[PDB]
Design an enzyme around this catalytic site. Structure first.
Site, PDB file in Angstrom:
ATOM      1  N   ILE A 111       0.848  -1.268   0.077  1.00 41.40           N
ATOM      2  CA  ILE A 111      -0.032  -0.043   0.048  1.00 41.40           C
ATOM      3  C   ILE A 111       0.888   1.387   0.058  1.00 41.40           C
ATOM      4  O   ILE A 111       1.722   1.390   0.818  1.00 41.40           O
ATOM      5  CB  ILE A 111      -0.962  -0.125   1.270  1.00 41.40           C
ATOM      6  CG1 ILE A 111      -1.783  -1.101   1.171  1.00 41.40           C
ATOM      7  CG2 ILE A 111      -1.664   1.197   1.118  1.00 41.40           C
ATOM      8  CD1 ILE A 111      -2.694  -1.357   2.333  1.00 41.40           C
ATOM      9  N   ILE A 112       0.611   2.022  -0.986  1.00 40.72           N
ATOM     10  CA  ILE A 112       1.128   3.725  -0.891  1.00 40.72           C
ATOM     11  C   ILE A 112       0.037   4.560  -0.551  1.00 40.72           C
ATOM     12  O   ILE A 112      -1.228   4.353  -1.137  1.00 40.72           O
ATOM     13  CB  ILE A 112       1.693   3.929  -2.146  1.00 40.72           C
ATOM     14  CG1 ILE A 112       2.760   2.795  -2.570  1.00 40.72           C
ATOM     15  CG2 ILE A 112       2.492   5.271  -2.260  1.00 40.72           C
ATOM     16  CD1 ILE A 112       2.337   1.862  -3.510  1.00 40.72           C
TER      17      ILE A 112
ATOM     18  N   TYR B 111      -8.721   5.252 -22.259  1.00 44.76           N
ATOM     19  CA  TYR B 111      -9.308   6.628 -22.251  1.00 44.76           C
ATOM     20  C   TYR B 111     -10.363   7.145 -23.240  1.00 44.76           C
ATOM     21  O   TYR B 111     -11.291   7.705 -22.975  1.00 44.76           O
ATOM     22  CB  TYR B 111      -7.679   7.508 -22.773  1.00 44.76           C
ATOM     23  CG  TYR B 111      -6.912   7.748 -21.659  1.00 44.76           C
ATOM     24  CD1 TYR B 111      -7.271   8.218 -20.267  1.00 44.76           C
ATOM     25  CD2 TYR B 111      -5.537   7.545 -21.798  1.00 44.76           C
ATOM     26  CE1 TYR B 111      -6.385   8.451 -19.504  1.00 44.76           C
ATOM     27  CE2 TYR B 111      -4.558   7.741 -21.037  1.00 44.76           C
ATOM     28  CZ  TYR B 111      -4.849   8.098 -19.708  1.00 44.76           C
ATOM     29  OH  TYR B 111      -4.016   8.297 -18.749  1.00 44.76           O
TER      30      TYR B 111
ATOM     31  N   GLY C 269      -6.618  20.246  -6.752  1.00 49.81           N
ATOM     32  CA  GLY C 269      -7.882  20.409  -6.711  1.00 49.81           C
ATOM     33  C   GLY C 269      -8.782  19.352  -7.488  1.00 49.81           C
ATOM     34  O   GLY C 269      -9.632  18.779  -6.908  1.00 49.81           O
TER      35      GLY C 269
ATOM     36  N   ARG D 115       4.713   6.366 -14.983  1.00 50.58           N
ATOM     37  CA  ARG D 115       5.170   6.066 -16.218  1.00 50.58           C
ATOM     38  C   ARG D 115       6.078   6.986 -16.816  1.00 50.58           C
ATOM     39  O   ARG D 115       7.121   6.549 -17.491  1.00 50.58           O
ATOM     40  CB  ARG D 115       4.234   5.716 -17.234  1.00 50.58           C
ATOM     41  CG  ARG D 115       3.434   4.323 -16.936  1.00 50.58           C
ATOM     42  CD  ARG D 115       2.096   4.602 -18.059  1.00 50.58           C
ATOM     43  NE  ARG D 115       1.257   3.437 -18.025  1.00 50.58           N
ATOM     44  CZ  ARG D 115       0.148   3.126 -18.884  1.00 50.58           C
ATOM     45  NH1 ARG D 115      -0.154   4.091 -19.587  1.00 50.58           N
ATOM     46  NH2 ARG D 115      -0.397   2.199 -18.757  1.00 50.58           N
TER      47      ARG D 115
ATOM     48  N   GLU E 180      -8.583  16.109  -5.466  1.00 52.67           N
ATOM     49  CA  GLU E 180      -9.445  16.372  -4.173  1.00 52.67           C
ATOM     50  C   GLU E 180     -10.816  15.582  -4.501  1.00 52.67           C
ATOM     51  O   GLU E 180     -11.545  15.076  -3.800  1.00 52.67           O
ATOM     52  CB  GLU E 180      -9.197  17.512  -3.656  1.00 52.67           C
ATOM     53  CG  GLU E 180     -10.257  17.922  -2.391  1.00 52.67           C
ATOM     54  CD  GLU E 180      -9.894  17.754  -1.130  1.00 52.67           C
ATOM     55  OE1 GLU E 180      -8.635  17.781  -0.750  1.00 52.67           O
ATOM     56  OE2 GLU E 180     -10.803  17.344  -0.373  1.00 52.67           O
TER      57      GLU E 180
ATOM     58  N   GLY F 245       3.459 -15.687 -16.475  1.00 56.23           N
ATOM     59  CA  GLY F 245       4.083 -16.362 -15.337  1.00 56.23           C
ATOM     60  C   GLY F 245       4.171 -15.578 -14.100  1.00 56.23           C
ATOM     61  O   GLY F 245       5.121 -16.090 -13.172  1.00 56.23           O
TER      62      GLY F 245
ATOM     63  N   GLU G  24       0.086   7.491 -15.101  1.00 56.77           N
ATOM     64  CA  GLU G  24       0.856   8.202 -16.238  1.00 56.77           C
ATOM     65  C   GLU G  24       2.115   9.094 -15.624  1.00 56.77           C
ATOM     66  O   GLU G  24       3.273   9.095 -16.059  1.00 56.77           O
ATOM     67  CB  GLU G  24       0.120   9.099 -17.153  1.00 56.77           C
ATOM     68  CG  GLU G  24      -1.227   8.700 -17.889  1.00 56.77           C
ATOM     69  CD  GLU G  24      -0.853   7.677 -18.973  1.00 56.77           C
ATOM     70  OE1 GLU G  24       0.420   7.075 -18.969  1.00 56.77           O
ATOM     71  OE2 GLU G  24      -1.814   7.267 -19.465  1.00 56.77           O
TER      72      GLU G  24
ATOM     73  N   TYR H 268      -1.379   0.483 -14.459  1.00 56.88           N
ATOM     74  CA  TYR H 268      -2.554   1.161 -14.909  1.00 56.88           C
ATOM     75  C   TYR H 268      -3.529   0.555 -13.725  1.00 56.88           C
ATOM     76  O   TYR H 268      -3.492  -0.494 -13.204  1.00 56.88           O
ATOM     77  CB  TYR H 268      -2.980   0.415 -16.230  1.00 56.88           C
ATOM     78  CG  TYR H 268      -3.965   1.685 -17.156  1.00 56.88           C
ATOM     79  CD1 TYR H 268      -3.545   2.731 -17.597  1.00 56.88           C
ATOM     80  CD2 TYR H 268      -5.465   1.487 -17.036  1.00 56.88           C
ATOM     81  CE1 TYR H 268      -4.150   3.757 -18.313  1.00 56.88           C
ATOM     82  CE2 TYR H 268      -6.179   2.458 -17.643  1.00 56.88           C
ATOM     83  CZ  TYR H 268      -5.725   3.456 -18.272  1.00 56.88           C
ATOM     84  OH  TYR H 268      -6.292   4.475 -18.962  1.00 56.88           O
TER      85      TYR H 268
ATOM     86  N   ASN I 169      -0.562  26.100  -7.434  1.00 52.96           N
ATOM     87  CA  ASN I 169      -2.138  25.835  -6.960  1.00 52.96           C
ATOM     88  C   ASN I 169      -3.070  25.960  -8.290  1.00 52.96           C
ATOM     89  O   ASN I 169      -4.080  26.660  -8.175  1.00 52.96           O
ATOM     90  CB  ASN I 169      -2.501  26.905  -5.661  1.00 52.96           C
ATOM     91  CG  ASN I 169      -3.754  26.465  -5.136  1.00 52.96           C
ATOM     92  OD1 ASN I 169      -4.240  25.271  -5.161  1.00 52.96           O
ATOM     93  ND2 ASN I 169      -4.478  27.530  -4.473  1.00 52.96           N
TER      94      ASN I 169
END
Ligand SMILES: CCc1ccccc1-c1ccc(C(=O)O)s1
Ligand SMILES: [Cl-]
Ligand SMILES: [Cl-]
Ligand SMILES: [Cl-]
Length: 256
Positions: free
Chosen positions: A5-6, A120, A139, A177, A142, A47, A174, A77, A192
């Protein structure tokens, strides 16, 4: 017992906290990666033991709502997510992937597979908005976290859910990646700012599979045929070899 977990929160998020997060995500994606050459190659899905297949990204916001995204270590993904006592998965492409996701969120009372995939082209259709008109930043993220959470309560409609997936996938998958896209998100967090990705970002996302192929099939880091990318202004230019790409692409899907 549990996949790695992150944790990330938008609450008081900084350039540094976002950088620490993407570093930790790349760390867990590349535990079983091929790191012998200039660019890491994610593990081959063929595998790969089920207990090494996924990582979990737990996202929180100022509202202290939490959702957990499941990422496939083979392509970085999002395959699905958990909100409270419900888990939601994109339609798997094959029977092997359908079996793999049965090992995610085994605890939850309610499991759902969407009729649609997480690509997408399909998410933009459901959202009714192209990536070029969906703002990214702290924003948007969130708001995406709240929208994903309230899908489990009936408070979020599918177009907003799809738009929220488009935001999370770009700012996590992304960004993991591509150092270029991580840097685009660092800039938005610093000022911001909420802003849609420009053509350089969208073309890079679109090109990930093609770049992974061209690099891994290269003759001593020289391509069979060149790859077209875009500048910020949408102008096209050719890439003939891996050289210019080592700072830009952080992770590649296994090719051969
Ligand atoms: C991600 C596309 C890329 C790949 C490798 C090297 C450079 C680039 C450029 C991004 C924006 C450019 C601009 O606006 O001129 S050029
Ligand atoms: Cl399932
Ligand atoms: Cl649009
Ligand atoms: Cl240039």
């Amino acid at each position: 017992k549990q996949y790695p977990i992150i944790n990330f929160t938008t609450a008081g998020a900084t350039v540094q906290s976002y950088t620490n997060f993407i570093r930790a995500v790349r760390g867990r994606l590349t535990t079983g990666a091929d790191v012998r050459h200039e660019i890491p190659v994610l593990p081959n899905r063929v595998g790969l033991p089920i207990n090494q297949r996924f990582i979990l990204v737990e996202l929180s916001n100022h509202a202290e709502l939490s959702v957990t995204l499941a990422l496939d270590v083979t392509n970085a993904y999002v395959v699905g997510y958990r909100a409270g006592n419900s888990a939601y998965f994109f339609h798997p492409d094959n029977q092997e992937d359908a079996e793999a996701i049965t090992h995610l969120f085994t605890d939850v009372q309610n499991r759902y597979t969407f009729a649609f995939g997480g690509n997408y082209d399909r998410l933009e259709q459901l959202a009714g908005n192209l990536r070029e008109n969906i703002e990214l930043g702290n924003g948007p993220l969130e708001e995406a976290i709240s929208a994903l959470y309230y899908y489990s309560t009936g408070g979020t409609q599918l177009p907003t859910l799809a738009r929220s997936f488009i935001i999370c996938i770009q700012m996590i998958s992304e960004a993991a990646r591509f150092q270029y896209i991580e840097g685009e998100m660092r800039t938005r967090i610093r000022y911001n700012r909420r802003s849609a990705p420009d053509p350089s970002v969208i073309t890079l996302e679109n090109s990930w599979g093609r770049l992974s192929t061209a690099i891994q099939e290269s003759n001593q880091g020289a391509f069979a045929s060149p790859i077209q990318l875009q500048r910020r202004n949408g102008s096209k230019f050719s890439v003939y070899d891996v050289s210019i790409l080592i700072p830009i692409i952080a992770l590649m899907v296994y090719r051969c």
